[PDB]
Amino acid sequence: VNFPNIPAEGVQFRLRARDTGYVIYSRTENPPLVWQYNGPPYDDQLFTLIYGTGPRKNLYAIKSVPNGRVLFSRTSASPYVGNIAGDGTYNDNWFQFIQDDNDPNSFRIYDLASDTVLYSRTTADPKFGNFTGAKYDDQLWHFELV
Amino acid sequence: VNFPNIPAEGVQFRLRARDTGYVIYSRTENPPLVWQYNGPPYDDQLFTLIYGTGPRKNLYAIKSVPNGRVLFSRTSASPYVGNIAGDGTYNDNWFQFIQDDNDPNSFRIYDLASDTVLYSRTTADPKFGNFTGAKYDDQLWHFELV
Numbered sequence A, B: 001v002n003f004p005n006i007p008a009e010g011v012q013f014r015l016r017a018r019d020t021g022y023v024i025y026s027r028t029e030n031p032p033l034v035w036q037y038n039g040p041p042y043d044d045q046l047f048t049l050i051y052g053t054g055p056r057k058n059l060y061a062i063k064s065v066p067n068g069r070v071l072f073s074r075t076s077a078s079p080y081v082g083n084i085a086g087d088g089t090y091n092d093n094w095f096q097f098i099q100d101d102n103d104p105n106s107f108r109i110y111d112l113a114s115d116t117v118l119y120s121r122t123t124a125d126p127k128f129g130n131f132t133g134a135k136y137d138d139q140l141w142h143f144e145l146v
């Protein structure tokens, strides 16, 4: 089931992991360019959605506020999660927000092109990334409105 | 996770529900045109897949062998599950086969356009149709190669 409370198109938000409490950031310099972060609020943690239409209905591009790049999540090449210019030129720029089966207030950030979800954990490296496999709680996110 | 054993493009199969053992048929006259059936093998139960590319990567159109029409699954008008000519002209002609998280040998027939899955049951009317909601066993299918 698609997450029923997706931010209106163009509205700004942070993406905060339910369990770790870390947020996603997206910047243009100093790798990792897209990763999780535990610390103060900065602009590179702010995103907006472009709503998919036609074949991309129910998918969304996740655009960085300060730099305008959109997120990607892929299994083809490192870095697996990153950013790129444009408004969703590539199929791996398109995400589905899938509500959790048990917790109605959290969702997985799912990528149809790569069949992956994003995760945030405090255990093994890489502590942030994408994953094709079983459902774990570390894959659960909130939209944090600003 | 996408079902790991999806039939190769053009390969013929029946879609059989894991639990009911019923199959999907797709005919050109007499509503319901697409429904479930318990009985001998007949040609309007035979399908092939058209593989999606680009924005339809990991999606598939389900095409009738005898009549060439593809399935659709929608929530906007009746019938909700039906068929239409072409090779997947419309967005709701495109399906994802999502492996069950508990039973790796079955999958859901998921529609991205309508956020629904197909089900087959012996309980309440309508006994076949589409559904947006919790994961249930009557939503689980097999590819039955012929």
Ligand SMILES: CC(=O)N[C@@H]1[C@@H](O[C@@H]2O[C@H](CO)[C@H](O)[C@H](O)[C@H]2O)[C@@H](O)[C@@H](CO)O[C@@H]1O
Pocket (backbone or CB within 6 Å): A025, A027, A031, A032, A035, A036, A037, A038, A042, A044, A045
């Ligand atoms: C101080 C420092 O090196 N922190 C690292 C992070 O870098 C910070 O990330 C935030 C994200 O909003 C912002 O871009 C800051 O300018 C930047 O210094 C980051 O690189 C992480 C990666 O795991 O490590 C430290 O936390």
Ligand SMILES: CC(=O)N[C@@H]1[C@@H](O[C@@H]2O[C@H](CO)[C@H](O)[C@H](O)[C@H]2O)[C@@H](O)[C@@H](CO)O[C@@H]1O
Pocket (backbone or CB within 6 Å): A071, A072, A074, A077, A079, A082, A084, A090, A092, A093
């Ligand atoms: C054509 C090419 O090699 N471009 C590289 C980029 O690769 C594209 O990245 C997008 C991201 O949405 C998508 O994965 C495409 O399939 C892929 O070809 C990219 O990797 C950048 C830096 O990440 O380098 C090249 O520009």
Ligand SMILES: CC(=O)N[C@@H]1[C@@H](O[C@@H]2O[C@H](CO)[C@H](O)[C@H](O)[C@H]2O)[C@@H](O)[C@@H](CO)O[C@@H]1O
Pocket (backbone or CB within 6 Å): A080, A119, A121, A125, A126, A129, A130, A131, A132, A136, A138, A139
């Ligand atoms: C088996 C294994 O280590 N696989 C790696 C992934 O780890 C899994 O990640 C999920 C994320 O939801 C969860 O934390 C599991 O417990 C863990 O096994 C992951 O690190 C990816 C990153 O690319 O690599 C392997 O697939």
Ligand SMILES: CC(=O)N[C@@H]1[C@@H](O[C@@H]2O[C@H](CO)[C@H](O)[C@H](O)[C@H]2O)[C@@H](O)[C@@H](CO)O[C@@H]1O
Pocket (backbone or CB within 6 Å): B119, B121, B124, B131, B136, B137, B138, B139
């Ligand atoms: C109340 C009702 O009609 N719910 C339907 C669902 O029924 C569930 O079925 C599963 C087995 O699949 C199990 O027996 C549950 O106890 C039962 O509630 C189910 O048929 C779905 C369709 O997948 O929708 C119905 O509404």
